């Protein structure tokens with residue numbers, strides 16, 4: 001089999017001419033030539049079967065990505081694995097090759113207002129579809145927004161995604177969270193498990209702020225730093241917003257803080273389009289019940305040159321896991337991954 005760095009990358013015969021892109025905790029990514037479609041693609045080698053958590057994340061993401069079909073959500077083109085469960089040690093996922101991501105773009109490039117508007121429209125268009133299926137992404141951030149050389153944008157990395165569950169969203173103060181710190185909504189640190197759609201709208205707001213300035217708006221170094229950043233811009237919550245927080249430890253922590261007044265957005269972003277700032281204000285609302293929903297955001301005047309609800313599809317049915325993937329042994333998960341990937345076998 002073809003080899004890359006130390007490692008076997010056995011994807012022949014359809015895929016040849018491999019080049020290293022990167023590695024991570026989650027596997028190795030290469031580009032390759034697709035001899036069938038005569039284009040270069042991206043392939044990720046995943047080796048998850050020894051670890052129950054890695055199996056869960058892998059199965060969840062495959063199921064979601066195979067079910068969704070939308071221009072602004074990355075798709076799975078092909079999945080390569082051994083013909084038998086006994087011989088399957090790795091899985092290779094094939095996706096369209098996307099040249100860059102919004103994280104890399106922001107590090108290196110000034111965005112025009114026209115690009116900011118188009119990027120935001122595409123994010124919200126994709127998010128409308130995701131939310132319409134009753135799924136929450138939960139880890140929206142610039143590195144999970146892939147771009148090609150014509151600025152087509154695709155949302156990726158659904159490893160932390162969950163079905164919405166408003167009724168079970170409550171929890172106590174300082175509950176652990178897994179998603180990326182700077183893009184976590186305030187309520188995560190206070191009283192929320194992140195099981196409602198409002199947590200994704202917050203993240204989009206953060207992304208919009210970062211596009212306007214090229215830097216993260218709330219770059220907290222740990223928990224109460226993440227909050228004290230937020231409150232230094234938004235100002236101290238009103239009595240009405242605190243009355244929403246029934247848990248005493250969370251409410252009394254917020255009452256213990258010195259008063260902060262709101263910093264107006266136009267002082268932070270003097271070059272920004274006023275319509276962009278109005279929409280930003282509505283996404284970065286402290287109280288999640290007052291936060292704008294995705295459809296209202298698409299209908300906002302900032303996006304009027306793109307808004308077309310007839311070209312902003314919704315899912316044909318809500319999404320549900322046929323099982324709870326938390327309590328299954330890794331051997332059962334291996335079998336399920338085998339079964340889900342069978343449709344790509346010759």
Ligand SMILES: Nc1nnnn1NCc1cccc(OCc2ccccc2)c1
Pocket residue numbers: 029042043044046058061062065074093094095096097098099146
């Ligand atoms: N699509 C793409 N182009 N350059 N980078 N990049 N994203 C990384 C990537 C490439 C190929 C396959 C990938 O698979 C991610 C994945 C991992 C587990 C389950 C389902 C999907 C990821």
